[PDB]
Symmetry: C3
Subunit: 32 residues, 3 copies
């Protein structure tokens, strides 16, 4: 379970960062 | 702590996916 | 590895919530 967990956190890290970047751009495009 | 961790990753998975979906729609609505 | 994992989930919790809040506002600003 520890390796399952670490693999999944590694994946979540990436998706969260991606979402941060997309939100940053959207904020710019809307002026927020 | 292992069960706490897994429960929390399970919850984070869901929220991240939800955020991905909402961002996808917003990108469409703004044209991004 | 357990402490590394918990520290990282704690950080991901925060970033996910932040992203939720930003998405909520954007949805309002676009009308989504
Ligand atoms: Cl990171
Ligand atoms: Cl997220
Ligand atoms: Cl998933
Ligand atoms: Cl939380």
């Amino acid at each position: 379970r520890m390796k399952q967990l670490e693999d999944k956190v590694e994946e979540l890290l990436s998706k969260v960062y991606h979402n941060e970047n997309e939100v940053a751009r959207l904020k710019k495009l809307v002026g927020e």
